[PDB]
Amino acid sequence: FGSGEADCGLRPLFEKKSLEDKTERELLESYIDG
Amino acid sequence: IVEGSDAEIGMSPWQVMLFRKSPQELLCGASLISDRWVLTAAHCLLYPPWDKNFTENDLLVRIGKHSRTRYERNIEKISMLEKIYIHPRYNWRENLDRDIALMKLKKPVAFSDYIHPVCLPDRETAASLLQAGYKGRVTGWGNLKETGQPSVLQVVNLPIVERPVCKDSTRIRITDNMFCAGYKPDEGKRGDACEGDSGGPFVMKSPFNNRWYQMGIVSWGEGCDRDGKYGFYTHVFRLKKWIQKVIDQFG
Amino acid sequence: GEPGAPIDYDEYAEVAQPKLYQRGEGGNGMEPIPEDYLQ
Ligand SMILES: *[C@@H]1O[C@H](CO)[C@@H](O)[C@H](O)[C@H]1NC(C)=O
Ligand code: NA
């Protein structure tokens, strides 16, 4: 048990379906030390 | 959650509601990290200033929930506690240092589209994500404002704040086991956690492997959504060594 | 862009107030769950 279970962090209704939620783009687009 | 929105179905499959058996009450948020290990804040089970001291038989965990109030049969599942593990160096007296606890379930929970664990960050993932300006996601059923309660789970995206700004924002001693998040007044946008959200997860999506990692636990604040004040979150990664000692010893 | 949290492990008058209800709000509107769970 390092980072957790083998399937952790991958949501059935989103990542496992290649669908994004409505605000997760905002999270990724903040990854810029500007 | 102040200035949040309604969660989408399955948007937060690791969200747990720590639930009091009698009287039937919402106790806290929590997070699913494995088939029988739930992460929460230590003050949800032990807070002497308010004479709070729950044992395993007092509490249940409701996983897969959306509604705050409705019993969501066939979608949510309810598990019982086998043991509670509060951090040995949890300090409630001054600044909720090491505000973290583990709860082992009596029987492993069955995963579904609404029940799924979150990852804990490795040294590489934590280092690249825990940077001021980077936004994480907070979820809970707590108050919608400081000055009432949502019908469904609430979500808000908040940025990590520079440690000097957190330190200057409050007279309370900050330690390295906590970080703070929220918008500055100059940034215009608003949002915060509030009473009822504590013990819930602060999570970040990794741009390396597309996984969600829990970086924080809703711990404390001075009011909710105040200009120049920020919510404080237990620093999960600093405590990850302890988290593992418990899951390897008593797993 | 600064690290809002140190990347190391915790090898081991004013009080912080946890974001925890204090006036029984956690019971408002709660629909009773099946009695089988309440034991
Ligand atoms: C909490 O309650 C238990 C009883 O199960 C007791 O043994 C423990 O010392 C208490 N801790 C406190 C009051 O800090
Ligand atoms: Na604020």
- Ranges of each domain in chain A: 1-34
User: Two tokens at B58?
Assistant: 């007092």
The answer to whether B15-117+240-249 and B118-236 have equal CATH topology is: yes
Q: How far apart are CA B85 and CA B79, in angstroms?
A: 17
Burial group, residue B173, by CB count within 10 angstroms (0-12, 13-18, 19+): exposed
Question: A14 and B13 in contact (C-beta within 8 Å)?
Answer: no
Identify the chains in contact with C, defined as 3+ C-beta pairs within 8 A. B
Cis peptide before B23 (omega within 30 of 0): yes
Q: Does B78 touch chain C (CB under 8 A)?
A: yes
Separation of B251 CA from ligand 1 center, angstroms?
23
B87 is catalytic: no
What is the enclosing helix (H) or strand (E) of A28? helix A24-28
- Best mutation site among B44, B45, B53 for ligand 1 pocket (most ligand atoms within 8 Å of CB): B53
Yes or no, beta carbons of B131 and C38 under 8 Å apart: no
Q: Which of B168, B201, B239, B195 is nearest to C5 (CA)?
A: B239
Assigned token pair, A33: 């030390």
Which residue reads 């709070």 in tokens?
B52
CATH topology of domain B15-117+240-249: Thrombin, subunit H (2.40.10)
Distance of CA B10 to the CA centre of its chain: 17
Q: Which of B244, B84, B245, B100 is nearest to B178 (CA)?
A: B100
Closest CA to A32 of B241, C20, B132: B132
First to last CA, chain C: 50
How many whole angstroms from its chain centre is CA B229?
Answer: 19
Q: Indicate which residue of B43, B66, B87, B235 is catalytic.
A: B43
Give one word for C22, left, alpha or beta, with left for phi > 0 and alpha for psi -120 to 50: alpha
The helix or strand, by DSSP H or E, that contains position B247, with its residue range, turns out to be helix B240-249
Which residues of chain B neighbour A13 with C-beta distances below 8 Å? 9-11, 13, 113-114
Cβ atoms < 10 Å from Cβ of B60:
22
Q: How was this structure determined?
A: X-ray
Q: Indicate the helix (H) or strand (E) that contains B82.
A: strand B77-86
| CA–CA distance, C26 with B131 (Å, rounded to integer) | 34
| Domain at A1-34, CATH class | few secondary structures
Report yes or no: A4 and B34 within 8 Å, Cβ to Cβ. Answer: yes
Active site residue B99: yes
B118-236 fold: Thrombin, subunit H (2.40.10)
Give the H/E segment covering residue B178. strand B178-181
> What are the structure tokens assigned to C3, written together?
């690290």
Q: How far apart are CA B176 and CA B200, in angstroms?
A: 19
Tell me the two tokens of residue B177.
Answer: 């086991």
Please classify residue A13 by burial: count the beta carbons closer than 10 Å to its beta carbon, then call 0-12 exposed, 13-18 middle and 19+ buried: middle
State how far the Cα of B164 lies from the Cα of B184, in Å rounded to an integer: 13
Matching residue, tokens 């409630």: B92
Q: Determine contact, residues B161/B189, Cβ cutoff 8 Å.
A: no
The residue of chain B with its CA nearest to that of A22 is B8
Q: Using alpha carbons, select from B83, B122, B130, B105 the residue that is nearest to residue B31.
A: B105
Closest CA to B102 of B163, B161, B153, B31: B31
